[PDB]
Amino acid sequence: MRECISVHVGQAGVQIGNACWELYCLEHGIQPDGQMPGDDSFNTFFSETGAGKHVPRAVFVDLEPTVIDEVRTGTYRQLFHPEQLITGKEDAANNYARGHYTIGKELIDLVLDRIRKLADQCTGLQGFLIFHSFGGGTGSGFTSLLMERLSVDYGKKSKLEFSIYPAPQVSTAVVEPYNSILTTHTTLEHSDCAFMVDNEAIYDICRRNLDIERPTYTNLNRLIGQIVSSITASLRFDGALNVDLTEFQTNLVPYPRIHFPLATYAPVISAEKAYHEQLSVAEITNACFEPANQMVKCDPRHGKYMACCLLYRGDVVPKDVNAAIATIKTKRTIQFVDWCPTGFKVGINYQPPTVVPGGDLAKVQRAVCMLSNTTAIAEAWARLDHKFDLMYAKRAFVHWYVGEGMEEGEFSEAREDMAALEKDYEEVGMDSV
Amino acid sequence: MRECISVHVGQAGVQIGNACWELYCLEHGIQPDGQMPDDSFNTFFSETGAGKHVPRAVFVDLEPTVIDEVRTGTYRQLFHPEQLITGKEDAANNYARGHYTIGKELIDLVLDRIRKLADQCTGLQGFLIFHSFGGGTGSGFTSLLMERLSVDYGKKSKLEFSIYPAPQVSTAVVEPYNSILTTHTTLEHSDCAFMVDNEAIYDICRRNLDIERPTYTNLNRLIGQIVSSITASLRFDGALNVDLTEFQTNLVPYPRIHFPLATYAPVISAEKAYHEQLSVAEITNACFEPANQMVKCDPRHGKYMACCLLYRGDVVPKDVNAAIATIKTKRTIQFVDWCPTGFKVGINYQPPTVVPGGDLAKVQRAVCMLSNTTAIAEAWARLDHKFDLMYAKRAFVHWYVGEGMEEGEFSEAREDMAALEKDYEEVGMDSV
Amino acid sequence: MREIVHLQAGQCGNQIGAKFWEVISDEHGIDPTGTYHGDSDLQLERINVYYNEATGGKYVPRAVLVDLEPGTMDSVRSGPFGQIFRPDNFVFGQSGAGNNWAKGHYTEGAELVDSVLDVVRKEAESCDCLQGFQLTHSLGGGTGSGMGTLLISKIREEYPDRIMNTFSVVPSPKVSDTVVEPYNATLSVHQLVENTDETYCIDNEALYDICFRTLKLTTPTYGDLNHLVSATMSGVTTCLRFPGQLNADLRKLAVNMVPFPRLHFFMPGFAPLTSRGSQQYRALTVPELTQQMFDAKNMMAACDPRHGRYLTVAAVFRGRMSMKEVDEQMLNVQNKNSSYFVEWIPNNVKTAVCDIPPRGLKMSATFIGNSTAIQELFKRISEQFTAMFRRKAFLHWYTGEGMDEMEFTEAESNMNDLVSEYQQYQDA
Amino acid sequence: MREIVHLQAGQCGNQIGAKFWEVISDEHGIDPTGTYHGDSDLQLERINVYYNEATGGKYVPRAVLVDLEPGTMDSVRSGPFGQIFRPDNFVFGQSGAGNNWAKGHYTEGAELVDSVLDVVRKEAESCDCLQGFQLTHSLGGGTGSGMGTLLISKIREEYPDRIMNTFSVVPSPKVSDTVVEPYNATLSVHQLVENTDETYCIDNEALYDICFRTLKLTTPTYGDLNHLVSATMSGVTTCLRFPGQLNADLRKLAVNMVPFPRLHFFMPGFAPLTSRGSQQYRALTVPELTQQMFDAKNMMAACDPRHGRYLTVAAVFRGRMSMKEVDEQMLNVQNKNSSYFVEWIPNNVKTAVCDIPPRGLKMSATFIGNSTAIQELFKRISEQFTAMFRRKAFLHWYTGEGMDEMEFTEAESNMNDLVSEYQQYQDA
Amino acid sequence: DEVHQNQILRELYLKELRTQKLYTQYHVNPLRKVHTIARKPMSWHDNLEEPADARFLNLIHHAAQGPRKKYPETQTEGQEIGWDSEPLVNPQRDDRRLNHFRVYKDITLYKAKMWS
């Protein structure tokens, strides 16, 4: 009944969903081991075993044994069924070839088997939430091995995807443009929706709105935790118009290949600001389309706004939305698309945005996850492609990528298929006449 | 619903606001933090939940100091971070750095916070700006601000209240320079710009209220009561009311002579009022008293294009009309020939307030006396020649021309303010 | 966050700036090492300008001590407040200068130049807003003259939008404890004037002459002179450490003051310099501190204000006061004396008041003026120069070094152009 | 789990590794006996990386102590942390190699290599999933360059899938205490380009600079130098043992760090080095740590990076820090010095964070770089070799044990092939 | 000059240790953000019982309080305004006989929702 498996793969995705599974333990009464001292609601994320223990549905993978081990030597060891927490034996070493053709062709079986077990324990499987990277070896190569093998098995069932994309210039890897382009060669054809974020824009988002300077990767992950808790808000606690995983996969994706939406959170706020600001439905809706709150660090002013979906959480009076979402259309600075006049989707849950203790997101009574399929991401792809042309022209960082079981010709294939995505995203920039 | 986004650019604005917002709070009832221990507040305040009655003023300056004093005062809770906007290094008395350099790295932000505060409002009716006319912040920045406002707020009021580069007392040497360039800009925008030079107020404080210590605090408080009165009809209610728009098309004569002169009526102190009256007339007569004027310019050397009286208190309309008559039966008081009528007068019962500490004692009545005198030419002429004398020997000009403004700008302004004088006597010429 | 970097440059600074870093310490509330014994929150609210927060409080200053001789900073270190400075900004070369500008700007300069600009570069990078590089040399000596002008000329080639406030002792007639003293001004003023913004000038003579009327102290060491010159430089930069009701930073006290890009030699002063038998019999208000600020007796530079014409004056006040009382006092000075103010600048003042007052003083004020009578000083060193250049005086140390004579001809020429430019605007 | 087989080779290598097991045993909480007595439990969760398991709950090091000269192994077992090593791992012969590459490679050294393979193969095949063999060797002689590269070319064919960390002491430029020093290096780089994957090369000379001047030790003994090089050995394998945020191991620090296969000669550097007088004023925070990394005065190789461009840079940080400040500030040190970095690789950094700080330090970060400036170390050895080989000098020791001049010629030819390789991808 | 360069640094470093007074007190500014770094949610490295400072709560709260309570005087401009913010006498802000406030009536309550 309304269930989904969350495969948190890669060293990025395990710590992305590190605070997500903490956050689902705050919404439901799940304790740090799993007990309540309720109802149907704890079904999409946690299971139920016997006594009253709620085993989650997570397939935490890291091909190196360093970070998952702290999940299984930490203060939530009892919570996760220890089969779920799966490590490897040695890393992927920022190598698409290592994470996909050698180290990983070993962890593949056990990982796939775990999903068969977590799926045959469900009756309402509606989608696969996979959280990975695009730059690291596990988050580019091993998640590609999952995405391709998930298709011959379970199949056309939705495969929603959250990942931290290569930031424009502010980057913590070197060879990361090599891994990202090869990922898209094996993620365009399989991932139904591939909801995007990077690291950069969130630092700014908790630099001006939250005045918490010098943010770390745990602040940077809890905000993604509130993103996924409002996207999966309707496979849970009830309310007004409710959106399942299939909704986003017909209303946020124009054409087959063009399936890279952009996710923003509206109520990015601290304790002192929220005391001095009544976040009504009006301004919470406008703040989404402001071009510094996009979590991708692009200029949406440059691009079209093809497909858009606005989620809601809390005291959201229906009327307010229609009015608010209309103001957004009238404004000509919010530039739109005439090959789809409609453009917009609404969804309202009644569960208020939960607040994680030891956090900085103040308790707010309303929230928006503004999922936008804009084409301003083609500019981010264009800066990720010339970032690769001036390296492959003189064959830098190739010797690790080829000795490890990957044909040299895949660099050309990934290159020319990625330039197709640029042309496809420009064919959907031309006004129809 | 009949609201006014306040804006305070420069030390002058922020500080006078610190004395203008104390008034707003005390008057309505809000305690000094934003916690009411009525719907008037809905015009100068936004009740964000519980009782946090948040204000509405984008305080802006290109140096910390001043803004920080409020961000850590007996009112630090009465606002928001993005409303007490601060800046890096000052423009240092250079219209250039405030309109061509430093300021340009702060304008986009200040503009956005006004947009936000505009979206919230149901019906905007005046962006009351507060500049100082003579610095880089309260003149150069105010230029870019008022300018941009006339590209988004388009046809909307922007009544301003600045400190005129006073004749004698002048704590600045590039003081004349900024004024001319600024006036040039604040002419194709400002719907009406009241001015109150420090000199006169420093003086009216010497006798009326007998304060023998005029400081930059007691002065700003009286400037506050002016704005209080101007916007009391769009706050409380009594009899004939005057919305901001009416001020303009009932005072501003032609599309440029928008520079009134205001003088609070009962500026008496405390013990003195135990030996005085407040006759509805007496105050109106004493309003025209040559000295009581709060801008350096005896109106004798000129006429009264269009006065606009704003009252407050137990003012029986009967006595009001009797007063405006017994002062028209006086030759000295002289109006222009192209306009008989007299003055657009209004009454708001809500009696005046009493910020604890200020001299201005409780007075049953109060007649703010705004007036478009045709004599301001006197003051204007002074600055034009002050600028002239200096621009002649290219004095203190290298620093401006090395921070953006071209030499051409100084000239354009010189002739613009000269043309101004011509369109200030031509309108006085007894229509023949 | 608008910050100042201090730029010590020799004996006539090391011991003057030592008192500087002692006056600001005793006012911002610090102690020998760093422990804040202060008594107010406002006292600490702007320390980011001068000091840098070290590990666990206990601040550390933005100074770099630059000298060729080793023993001139050992006096600084062994002093009562010498531990404060970073022990790695005590940058020093080895051989002495011997008061030679060539041996301080050309030969043994360059060794202690790329090392000095490294510390200046690092200390400038750790800054939020940078609008000051305040330096303390003396013209008259050779280290401060040689290092100063050379150190000035490369910050301007690296960081050219900054207020270069360079306090300096000038060569002056009645006390003259160096004999190549005329040589080390004209080469110095040549480089000083065209690369600086603010050059508050003192001489020992008037500063000594302040002692033997005003304070009527029986015997001075140089230490009291340092306290009397460091009190000005605290007052000039009080709008940047303390708030008030009219604020004015260093760019405010130059662009509103200096008329043309040469006329930046200003003139310091301290108002309540009242003695030991007359403090009891004198009041404290702006009028009484108008006699003791506008008098030549508390002037410091060299000259007499009633020998030229004031071109632009300011006075940064400090304390709890009213202010018709600043402005009428200012207005009456300007109207009762309208013979010594340039008539082509109608208003001649820029007062600025900072409520936070000096320690142990109801109210204080710092007077700064651009008097034309700086001409009394600059012509006097030139006539002492012309008695040297003609007969090939103490110059073979200069020429044998590598200095050509033409650069000595450039020294009187630019100053003779300068002294003409300072009397031209007097006539107008 | 993921372990390292440590490989003290050569006279020098025993002394660096002895200090390596002095700092690791403190980081891992190990006694000079092997009995764990520490505060946290993090220093047991990956104890198996360096230290093995024995009965009695005692941790024995995975260290293979090899040297032809017996005067070192008695010394490392007569020191502070000496009774930890497994006693048969000491694989001494009894003959001095006489700083002769021929003796240690093609002669008597070959007697010992088959015994030291047996010790390694015991400790390598008795372990879960090996990553490689960190080596501290001594390119100035015969127990180093000789026994080293022969061991290194006799591990890369039995286990040809593993990291080959080769921390090397290359000949320092002016610092020289071997007369046949340039022969031993130039004959060994050939056997150190085609086997090793990460050759972090040090000189003594810069370690004498960072100790005597930067860290300011009065009498720099040689043992003070070995603590500095232990930092860059401990800090390069520290995400691999101690947990935290974004990690980095040897293969991570190879793939983003080796542009082309013969481009692995890196250059180390620590970061939070202070002095006694400048420990307590310097504020330990992420800003100050980034600059000393790239500064040439704290750099364990005889080259300012000014004459060249970094092909790639890594930084493996260590401490409780944020992560905006980690890479935004080094983006600043990536774009402010655009000529100092390559343009054919746009971003040049791998970062890492370990939560656990060092012993007595709030943060640290060892810095490794593939600069173009490695070529000068490799230019000067070639220049030193040509003056040597031009008239067949010092060759009757290097030819009486099996070595022909035909092999000598090959050594130089591939030696100056590398300086071309670090010049083809220079400015260009 | 290298043999000389060692001893000129030897002499300087010896005077550094003869005259050096150590740090003694941890001061901490209450009026500057110390910029705390967040904790990993699932971690026994970070989620332990480390005690907090009792005084730093007092110094922050004293930094918060009010200028009316911090200083028994009127230091700096801006503190004298709002210094005595109480009404002189109780205003009786409830009677229409002397106070003439507004109330928006039922349409004017609602009508603002049409334009908003």
Ligand SMILES: Nc1nc2c(ncn2[C@@H]2O[C@H](COP(=O)(O)OP(=O)(O)OP(=O)(O)O)[C@@H](O)[C@H]2O)c(=O)[nH]1
């Ligand atoms: N926000 C956030 N980003 C992360 C986190 N962990 C990793 N990343 C991102 O991931 C990129 C590289 O880390 P990973 O992809 O996780 O490394 P990996 O997948 O293990 O690759 P290998 O180590 O080679 O196996 C960096 O650019 C980070 O921005 C995290 O916990 N939070």
Ligand SMILES: Nc1nc2c(ncn2[C@@H]2O[C@H](COP(=O)(O)OP(=O)(O)OP(=O)(O)O)[C@@H](O)[C@H]2O)c(=O)[nH]1
């Ligand atoms: N009423 C009032 N007037 C002020 C105040 N501060 C300055 N003034 C007047 O404004 C004139 C010029 O303004 P400034 O003092 O330069 O302050 P500003 O307008 O913000 O300009 P900047 O210094 O560049 O920031 C001065 O000559 C003062 O007479 C104040 O706080 N209150």
Ligand SMILES: Nc1nc2c(ncn2[C@@H]2O[C@H](COP(=O)(O)OP(=O)(O)O)[C@@H](O)[C@H]2O)c(=O)[nH]1
């Ligand atoms: N005010 C003041 N003057 C000083 C001090 N030390 C030296 N002087 C003056 O400097 C002049 C000599 O300069 P000199 O020491 O040769 O300068 P140097 O070349 O930089 O060392 C004398 O006339 C002194 O009056 C001091 O601590 N304070």
Ligand SMILES: Nc1nc2c(ncn2[C@@H]2O[C@H](COP(=O)(O)OP(=O)(O)O)[C@@H](O)[C@H]2O)c(=O)[nH]1
């Ligand atoms: N690594 C290390 N270096 C040393 C030691 N003693 C000297 N050195 C340096 O190593 C170089 C000489 O190497 P050498 O000891 O002859 O290497 P060997 O062939 O193994 O004996 C010189 O430049 C010394 O500075 C030592 O104990 N450890």
Ligand SMILES: [Mg+2]
């Ligand atoms: Mg990993």
Ligand SMILES: [Mg+2]
């Ligand atoms: Mg100002």
